[PDB]
From Swiss-Prot, chain A:
Family: Belongs to the TUBGCP family.
Tissue: Widely expressed, with highest levels in heart and skeletal muscle and moderate levels in brain.
Gene label: TUBGCP5
Name of the protein in question: Gamma-tubulin complex component 5
Subcellular localization: Cytoplasm, Cytoskeleton, Microtubule organizing center, Centrosome
Assembly, per entry: Component of the gamma-tubulin ring complex (gTuRC) consisting of TUBGCP2, TUBGCP3, TUBGCP4, TUBGCP5 and TUBGCP6 and gamma-tubulin TUBG1 or TUBG2. TUBGCP2, TUBGCP3, TUBGCP4, TUBGCP5 and TUBGCP6 assemble in a 5:5:2:1:1 stoichiometry; each is associated with a gamma-tubulin, thereby arranging 14 gamma-tubulins in a helical manner. Gamma-tubulin at the first position is blocked by TUBGCP3 at the last position, allowing 13 protafilaments to grow into a microtubule.
Function description: Component of the gamma-tubulin ring complex (gTuRC) which mediates microtubule nucleation. The gTuRC regulates the minus-end nucleation of alpha-beta tubulin heterodimers that grow into microtubule protafilaments, a critical step in centrosome duplication and spindle formation.
Portion of the parent chain present: 13 to 118 of 1024
Curated annotation (Swiss-Prot), chain B:
Family designation: Belongs to the MOZART1 family.
Signal peptide range: none
Entry's Gene Ontology cellular component terms: centrosome; cytosol; gamma-tubulin ring complex; interphase microtubule organizing center; spindle
Whole-protein coverage range: 14 to 74 of 82
Gene from which this protein is expressed: MZT1
Entry keywords, A to Z: Acetylation, Cytoplasm, Cytoskeleton
Protein's cellular compartments: Cytoplasm, Cytoskeleton, Microtubule organizing center, Centrosome; Cytoplasm, Cytoskeleton, Spindle
GO biological process: gamma-tubulin complex localization; microtubule nucleation by interphase microtubule organizing center; mitotic spindle assembly
The protein, known as: Mitotic-spindle organizing protein 1
Highest rank taxon of the organism: Eukaryota
Known function: Required for the recruitment and the assembly of the gamma-tubulin ring complex (gTuRC) at the centrosome. The gTuRC regulates the minus-end nucleation of alpha-beta tubulin heterodimers that grow into microtubule protafilaments, a critical step in centrosome duplication and spindle formation.
Primary location group: cytoplasm
Natural source organism: Homo sapiens
Quaternary structure and partners: Associates with the gamma-tubulin ring complex (gTuRC) consisting of TUBGCP2, TUBGCP3, TUBGCP4, TUBGCP5 and TUBGCP6 and gamma-tubulin TUBG1 or TUBG2; within the complex, interacts with TUBGCP3 and TUBGCP6 to form a luminal bridge with actin that stabilizes the initial structure during complex assembly. Interacts with TUBG1.
Length: 96, 61
């Protein structure tokens, strides 16, 4: 129920279509849902996400961006304490 | 209690900063949408796919 509202807001927000009575709104929505229901990915692997996070930290350190490395480690450590943790992180990694 | 909304406020702000370091382009409003969808079990790679195409075809409109 709130899912359906969320997907509509996602379309409005990301695609910039604020008028649900625009045929382009409904076309974007049908596409979003059809995309969501076409199961085609493996489930999120937490260990692989953790390796990537730690890889981002190394890259910051390698380039001597100390205030970004310390921030990166601090934020991800804090977040990873209270499955959805890794799903959220995977999405952000995919949008990087 | 009233102490759960400040907790959620703290995590959402951690997440937005993580999102900014990664340069995802998300605002706090759409980031909150994404969190709820992930918690409800939408596949994150499906959601990434949807978001990237809804962007690819809006500057084009």
């Amino acid at each position: 129920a709130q899912q359906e509202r969320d997907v509509r807001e996602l379309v409005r927000g990301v695609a910039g279509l604020q008028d649900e009575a625009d045929p382009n709104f409904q076309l974007a929505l049908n596409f979003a849902w059809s995309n969501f229901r076409f199961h085609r990915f493996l489930d999120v692997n937490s260990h692989k996400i953790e390796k990537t996070i730690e890889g981002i930290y190394e890259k910051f350190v390698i380039h001597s961006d100390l205030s970004k490395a310390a921030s990166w480690k601090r934020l991800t450590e804090e977040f990873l304490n209270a499955d959805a943790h890794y799903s959220i992180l995977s999405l952000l990694l995919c949008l990087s | 209690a009233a102490a759960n909304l400040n907790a959620v406020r703290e995590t959402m702000d951690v997440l937005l900063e993580i999102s900014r370091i990664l340069n995802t382009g998300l605002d706090m409003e759409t980031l909150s949408i994404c969190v709820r969808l992930c918690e409800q079990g939408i596949n994150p790679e499906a959601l990434s796919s949807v978001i990237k195409e809804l962007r690819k075809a809006t500057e084009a409109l």
